Amino acid sequence: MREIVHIQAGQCGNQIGAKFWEVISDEHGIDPTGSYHGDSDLQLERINVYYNEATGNKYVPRAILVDLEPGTMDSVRSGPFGQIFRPDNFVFGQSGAGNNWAKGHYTEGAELVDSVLDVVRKESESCDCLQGFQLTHSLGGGTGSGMGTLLISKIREEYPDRIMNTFSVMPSPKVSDTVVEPYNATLSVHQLVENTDETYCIDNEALYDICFRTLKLTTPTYGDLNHLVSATMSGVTTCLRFPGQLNADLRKLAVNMVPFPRLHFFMPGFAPLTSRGSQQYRALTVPELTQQMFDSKNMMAACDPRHGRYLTVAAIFRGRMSMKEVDEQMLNVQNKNSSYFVEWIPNNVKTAVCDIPPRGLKMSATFIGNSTAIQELFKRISEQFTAMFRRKAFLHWYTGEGMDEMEFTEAESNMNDLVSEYQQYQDATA
Amino acid sequence: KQSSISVAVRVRPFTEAESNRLVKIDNDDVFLGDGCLTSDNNNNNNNSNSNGNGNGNGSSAANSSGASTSRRAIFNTLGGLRKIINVVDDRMLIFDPPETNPLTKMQRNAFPNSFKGSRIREHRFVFDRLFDEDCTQDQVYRNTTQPLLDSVLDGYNATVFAYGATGCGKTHTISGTPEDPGVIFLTMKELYNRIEELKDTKIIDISLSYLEIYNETIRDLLNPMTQCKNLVIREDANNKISVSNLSRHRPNSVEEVMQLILEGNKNRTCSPTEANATSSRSHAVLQINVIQKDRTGDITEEHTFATLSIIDLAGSERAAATKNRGARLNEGANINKSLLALGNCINALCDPRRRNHVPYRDSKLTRLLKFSLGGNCKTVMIVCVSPSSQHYDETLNTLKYADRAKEIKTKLIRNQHN
Amino acid sequence: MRECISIHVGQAGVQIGNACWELYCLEHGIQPDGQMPSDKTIGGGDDSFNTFFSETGAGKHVPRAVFVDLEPTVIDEVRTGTYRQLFHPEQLITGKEDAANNYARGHYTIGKEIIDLVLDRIRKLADQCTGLQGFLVFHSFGGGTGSGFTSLLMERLSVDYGKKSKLEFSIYPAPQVSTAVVEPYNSILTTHTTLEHSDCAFMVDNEAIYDICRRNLDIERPTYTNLNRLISQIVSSITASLRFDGALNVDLTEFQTNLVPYPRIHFPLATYAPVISAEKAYHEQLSVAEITNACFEPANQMVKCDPRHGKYMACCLLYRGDVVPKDVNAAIATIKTKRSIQFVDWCPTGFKVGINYQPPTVVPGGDLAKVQRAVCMLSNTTAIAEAWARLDHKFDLMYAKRAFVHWYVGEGMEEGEFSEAREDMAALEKDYEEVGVDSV
Numbered sequence A: 001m002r003e004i005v006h007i008q009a010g011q012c013g014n015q016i017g018a019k020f021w022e023v024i025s026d027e028h029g030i031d032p033t034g035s036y037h038g039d040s041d042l043q044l045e046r047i048n049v050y051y052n053e054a055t056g057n058k059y060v061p062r063a064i065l066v067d068l069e070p071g072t073m074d075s076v077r078s079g080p081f082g083q084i085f086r087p088d089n090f091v092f093g094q095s096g097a098g099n100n101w102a103k104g105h106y107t108e109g110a111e112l113v114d115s116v117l118d119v120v121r122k123e124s125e126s127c128d129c130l131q132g133f134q135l136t137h138s139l140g141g142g143t144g145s146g147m148g149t150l151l152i153s154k155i156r157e158e159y160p161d162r163i164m165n166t167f168s169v170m171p172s173p174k175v176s177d178t179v180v181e182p183y184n185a186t187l188s189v190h191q192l193v194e195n196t197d198e199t200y201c202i203d204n205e206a207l208y209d210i211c212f213r214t215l216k217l218t219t220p221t222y223g224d225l226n227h228l229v230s231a232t233m234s235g236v237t238t239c240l241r242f243p244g245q246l247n248a249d250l251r252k253l254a255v256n257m258v259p260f261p262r263l264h265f266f267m268p269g270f271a272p273l274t275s276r277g278s279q280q281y282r283a284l285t286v287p288e289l290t291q292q293m294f295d296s297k298n299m300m301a302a303c304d305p306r307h308g309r310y311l312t313v314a315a316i317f318r319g320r321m322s323m324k325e326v327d328e329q330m331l332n333v334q335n336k337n338s339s340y341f342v343e344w345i346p347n348n349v350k351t352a353v354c355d356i357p358p359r360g361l362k363m364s365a366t367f368i369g370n371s372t373a374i375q376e377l378f379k380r381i382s383e384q385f386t387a388m389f390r391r392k393a394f395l396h397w398y399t400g401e402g403m404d405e406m407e408f409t410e411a412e413s414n415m416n417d418l419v420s421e422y423q424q425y426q427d428a429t430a
Numbered sequence B: 001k002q003s004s005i006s007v008a009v010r011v012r013p014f015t016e017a018e019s020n021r022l023v024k025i026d027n028d029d030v031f032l033g034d035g036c037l038t039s040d041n042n043n044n045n046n047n048s049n050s051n052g053n054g055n056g057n058g059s060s061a062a063n064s065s066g067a068s069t070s071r072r073a074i075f076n077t078l079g080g081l082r083k084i085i086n087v088v089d090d091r092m093l094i095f096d097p098p099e100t101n102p103l104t105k106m107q108r109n110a111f112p113n114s115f116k117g118s119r120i121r122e123h124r125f126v127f128d129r130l131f132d133e134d135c136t137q138d139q140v141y142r143n144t145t146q147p148l149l150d151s152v153l154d155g156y157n158a159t160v161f162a163y164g165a166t167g168c169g170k171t172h173t174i175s176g177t178p179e180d181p182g183v184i185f186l187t188m189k190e191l192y193n194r195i196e197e198l199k200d201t202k203i204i205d206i207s208l209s210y211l212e213i214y215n216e217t218i219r220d221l222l223n224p225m226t227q228c229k230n231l232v233i234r235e236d237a238n239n240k241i242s243v244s245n246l247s248r249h250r251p252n253s254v255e256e257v258m259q260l261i262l263e264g265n266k267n268r269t270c271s272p273t274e275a276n277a278t279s280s281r282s283h284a285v286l287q288i289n290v291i292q293k294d295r296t297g298d299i300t301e302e303h304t305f306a307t308l309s310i311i312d313l314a315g316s317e318r319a320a321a322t323k324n325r326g327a328r329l330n331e332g333a334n335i336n337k338s339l340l341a342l343g344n345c346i347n348a349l350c351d352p353r354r355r356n357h358v359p360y361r362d363s364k365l366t367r368l369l370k371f372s373l374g375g376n377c378k379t380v381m382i383v384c385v386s387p388s389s390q391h392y393d394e395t396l397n398t399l400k401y402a403d404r405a406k407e408i409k410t411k412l413i414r415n416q417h418n
Numbered sequence C: 001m002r003e004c005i006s007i008h009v010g011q012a013g014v015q016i017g018n019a020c021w022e023l024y025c026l027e028h029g030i031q032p033d034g035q036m037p038s039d040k041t042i043g044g045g046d047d048s049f050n051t052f053f054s055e056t057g058a059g060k061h062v063p064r065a066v067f068v069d070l071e072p073t074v075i076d077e078v079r080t081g082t083y084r085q086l087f088h089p090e091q092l093i094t095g096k097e098d099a100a101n102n103y104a105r106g107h108y109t110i111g112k113e114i115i116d117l118v119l120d121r122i123r124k125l126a127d128q129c130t131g132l133q134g135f136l137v138f139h140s141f142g143g144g145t146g147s148g149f150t151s152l153l154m155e156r157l158s159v160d161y162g163k164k165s166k167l168e169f170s171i172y173p174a175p176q177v178s179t180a181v182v183e184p185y186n187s188i189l190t191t192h193t194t195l196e197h198s199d200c201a202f203m204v205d206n207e208a209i210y211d212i213c214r215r216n217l218d219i220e221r222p223t224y225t226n227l228n229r230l231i232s233q234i235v236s237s238i239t240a241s242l243r244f245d246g247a248l249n250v251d252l253t254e255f256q257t258n259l260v261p262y263p264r265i266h267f268p269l270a271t272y273a274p275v276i277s278a279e280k281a282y283h284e285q286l287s288v289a290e291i292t293n294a295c296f297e298p299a300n301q302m303v304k305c306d307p308r309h310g311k312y313m314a315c316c317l318l319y320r321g322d323v324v325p326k327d328v329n330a331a332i333a334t335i336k337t338k339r340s341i342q343f344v345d346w347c348p349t350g351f352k353v354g355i356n357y358q359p360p361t362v363v364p365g366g367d368l369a370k371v372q373r374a375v376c377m378l379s380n381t382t383a384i385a386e387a388w389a390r391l392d393h394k395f396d397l398m399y400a401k402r403a404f405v406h407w408y409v410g411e412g413m414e415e416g417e418f419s420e421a422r423e424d425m426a427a428l429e430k431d432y433e434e435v436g437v438d439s440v
């Protein structure tokens, strides 16, 4: 009975939430109107990790919608699932806040962050424990990257004895072409290197490349780029809400995959690949699945793992399957690979198994593999931040709101240091 | 033009409460017991009660450590000088003194029982300068910072930081007391006197700055009411660490600056419960910026800048005592994380292979010390380590760190121009 | 008389404790619903088997133990298990967080929140023991609450109750079933805290248990139930020398005198060789001359080591079931002729022996055959030091880069603890190395 409160900010965060919450309600056998209907009694074992009891056997979600522009509220209030959230779950203003980061961070955020913090306090007053809050935002437009970062920087002070979870959707030039995006990402990223110790580096470049190259869709809609992120994060958070031997509370996730407080950037993956609808694929053998996981084609970060190395590759398997199937080839994969696992860590790989499978697909798997090849992400952003800052164009949109010019060089130096730190462990053997 | 960080150690004088325990036990053993022993005729070895009634008139009240040498009765602990520091001269010291008790003498060539304890620990530590228990403030000043301040007015920068665990007198060593001065007071008085001596040939001006790193935040003790949320560290594009919204007051008279320093030091949080009311529960950085202006009005204008940094570091508090955990434990744990960052930075820097990274971007203190370690300034350490056997592993860890950081390289070229 | 007290700290401790309490409750004819047939006549008193259990007004024999675990999940499972009425409703329910795979968290931060109630309940149990003998604690090196709450509770109870004999049953970790990578740090720190306050500690290697359950028993991927049962068998074998008072019943305490030369060198091994699968045990019955010779084979140990190359300090054989003294002397004389067995050069004192007349039992629905001629060993050696060296090797690979240290440091612990514990274990290894030197 270790509770979590899910605060979601920004339009993209709101839609990822409206998809993921429906996925969870489907797996645990709760449909809209809040009632229980499933095909096993393992579902009610750890329902309180995410959901919450209410009167009349109603299992209302426990989450807050942060959205300034009121369009998303009307989108979700009559969406697929968003018809059960309590009336006071929503917090909103009467403005859009635009792509100007400082507009949401400094002048507009101060008006409504008080209400958001008050509602978070109210939610924390009803339970008896709190593992650590979870966030779903993106390093993109102003509203999300401002309000989410402000909520992190405040609630970290208000509850310092917790581990912070943030789901970051790193934006690429392909999925959107607003040229103030590298500035916003490069500045918002180092406001999370300090205040949160557990973040997932979901990439848009890799998502688009996979949805264009493997899946033959040629007009990738945002209703089909969400159907990879939602599934991946459900696979990530399968452990918490079902009983299991492996990590059953964030602190465990951190302690198993945070070698240092600064290097907490992962690259989640996915063994099968599914489009929306009722489409299905052939049955998967476990050796084929484990071989397919390692290769770069399924990675949701643009970096190539073959270039660098790994640190912790904690993995999860779904559905019904004999346990001894998984431990045979895995160790061999650990052996044939000469040097693509770091040595000075002992016992890198770890594995678990769960019973209830995903919706429709009866065999799948996930893994939260931390890596030292992730630098190619940030080493790319520096090439889309140094070019604009050498001529220092577009500053007057941010400088004319309250922020100085020192902070941008602070962010650039921070990213360079993080890249160098990740690079140093590449050849720092035992 | 190469330089080298130098080191200097201070040993606390025994406090009264444990001084009594020292006097009760250690004296007889050193003089006419373990120190010299006696012929094959000594009718009593060590159970004699002529040491201030250390034993009852009968059987021993408690189990002895060995051969009735110590642990004569039930108390909180023996707390003798069985493992202490030895200050034999002013260029070398030995820790874990050999042949301190006869039990060690029988523990040689005999069965390898408690063997290899002190034999493996036969390590001689060769520092630059050492101090005794009996020195006063002027004695430490006369060789810790006088060449350093001779350097600072010429143009070079300089830095000194405290060290060591709790109870070793870092605040008294540096920040002084309301009666006994520190090191900053003497430096300020000498700076004023050198200003007067060098007046009418070169004008000099000084600026003061003072900050603390409580709870890994930032605060300025010269000016409260500035919320820590406003204060942050930032950085220019040329490796500068100028904090925002520093007060940066300027003095004009000795009384003004000392009164302001006292008023600022009043605000630091401290533990009020135990007799150690001097317990500094936060780091502190004082900076004195000195700027010269020549008066010849002709060629050879040596317009030069310089700065001097004094740092007080809150000690590392282990689980020994420190009740009402959570509160005291959190205030201790943040300091522990900062000290871990400092130690990791030192260990990374001293090597010849990991130098390409030298991680400074860490907890706040390791960032504010960026210029201090590997920049341009000269540095001299002042590490306070207690000698009592009660604080043994504290002494060993602190002194091991002191042996570390003795091999640092920092090119210095002054701030001269024109 | 000699009422011991059993403590189980951590999930592994609670699992092994539930298995062992099931086994003991079944062996002595005590029903899971409390009552038993013999007390219909005896009623109660100070018999041999009343040492663990107790009496009450209704005769419900309440077990002498308190279950300690910061996670309320397993405590609820035991409360919701099959033994609802046996344990009195005073299990230490923890409605708060847990160590969560961190020794520092369990020791300092959250451990002090409940230690007062733990001491209160242990005192309530102890005060009913007129002749309290000692404490048998169950913990794990690599765990969370197991690593630290035990290391605190032992000190608190030792200071409170003076010098009483304390026994700890350890589960040294293995990489096949490791739930973490910080297990070495917890192991070294809790051994540093534990070495100077534990009379004797028993190493139940999980790798050895798993390997033996794979080879002897034919199960390919044994879940934790099989390991729990097989370890509970060893615990019952060692503990069965207290509940009975038959002839030749050398007491459990009297072994300690012959096992621990000095108070730091008290890590002995433990072997067991009646294990045979349920469906394959027929068509053969074992003899003592073969059983006692089987226990010396390296394949049936419970800490991976090679005593053949090293040296033997002492030995102690404990038999069970039905063995006549005429055979054991011949068996000992036979095995003494083996050249590979070599004793230390200052103690040829030979193999102390003990016999208990009671047949071993297994739970219904288990997997082990009901072999009557069960034998157990307890023999120190210099080969066990190799195990510690393995852990030290890990510490050399995960401390040059300072990995994971901040998690422990941020709970309220200095950095100096780790080097101190490492030097302590290095001293242990060197002490084990030096005892094997010749007497010349």
Ligand SMILES: CC[C@H](C)[C@@H]([C@@H](CC(=O)N1CCC[C@H]1[C@H](OC)[C@@H](C)C(=O)N[C@@H](Cc1ccccc1)c1nccs1)OC)N(C)C(=O)[C@@H](NC(=O)[C@H](C(C)C)N(C)C)C(C)C
Binding pocket: A011, A012, A015, A173, A174, A175, A176, A177, A219, A220, A221, A222, A223, A224
């Ligand atoms: C590859 C880049 C983007 C994928 C692309 C998508 C965006 C999109 O699909 N979007 C942007 C909001 C709307 C969404 C879809 O538009 C088609 C809409 C119908 C929808 O369904 N929106 C829903 C998703 C949904 C689906 C089903 C049910 C419920 C909801 C959302 N609600 C909230 C957030 S998204 O447009 C095809 N974008 C940004 C573009 O700007 C266009 N491409 C370009 O500009 C290219 C670059 C960017 C390649 N240029 C270089 C020339 C595009 C018109 C060809």
Ligand SMILES: Nc1nc2c(ncn2[C@@H]2O[C@H](COP(=O)(O)OP(=O)(O)OP(=O)(O)O)[C@@H](O)[C@H]2O)c(=O)[nH]1
Binding pocket: C009, C010, C011, C012, C013, C015, C016, C071, C098, C099, C100, C101, C102, C140, C142, C143, C144, C145, C146, C171, C173, C174, C177, C178, C179, C180, C206, C209, C224, C227, C228, C231
């Ligand atoms: N031999 C054996 N070992 C076990 C068993 N259950 C758990 N373990 C060991 O316990 C370790 C996991 O940590 P635990 O000792 O259980 O710690 P905990 O009791 O769960 O307490 P927390 O770590 O705070 O949750 C694993 O490395 C296992 O080796 C068991 O049934 N048999």
Ligand SMILES: Nc1ncnc2c1ncn2[C@@H]1O[C@H](COP(=O)(O)OP(=O)(O)NP(=O)(O)O)[C@@H](O)[C@H]1O
Binding pocket: B011, B012, B013, B015, B165, B166, B167, B168, B169, B170, B171, B172, B276, B277, B278, B279, B280, B281, B314, B315
């Ligand atoms: N060299 C010294 N001469 C005289 N008194 C000393 C000396 N060193 C320490 N003391 C005394 O020892 C006590 C402890 O000093 P204190 O200032 O608390 O050390 P500290 O390390 O600065 N405090 P803390 O922040 O907890 O580490 C005070 O009463 C000092 O006066």
Ligand SMILES: Nc1nc2c(ncn2[C@@H]2O[C@H](COP(=O)(O)OP(=O)(O)O)[C@@H](O)[C@H]2O)c(=O)[nH]1
Binding pocket: A010, A011, A012, A013, A015, A096, A097, A098, A099, A138, A140, A141, A142, A143, A144, A169, A170, A171, A172, A175, A176, A181, A204, A207, A222, A225, A226, A229
């Ligand atoms: N992967 C993914 N990214 C998205 C989606 N919607 C928006 N984004 C990203 O988020 C950014 C838009 O920020 P947004 O939250 O809309 O700002 P707001 O309009 O002020 O609330 C864009 O740059 C996109 O890269 C989505 O559905 N999926």
Ligand SMILES: [Mg+2]
Binding pocket: C010, C011, C071, C098, C144, C145
């Ligand atoms: Mg546990």
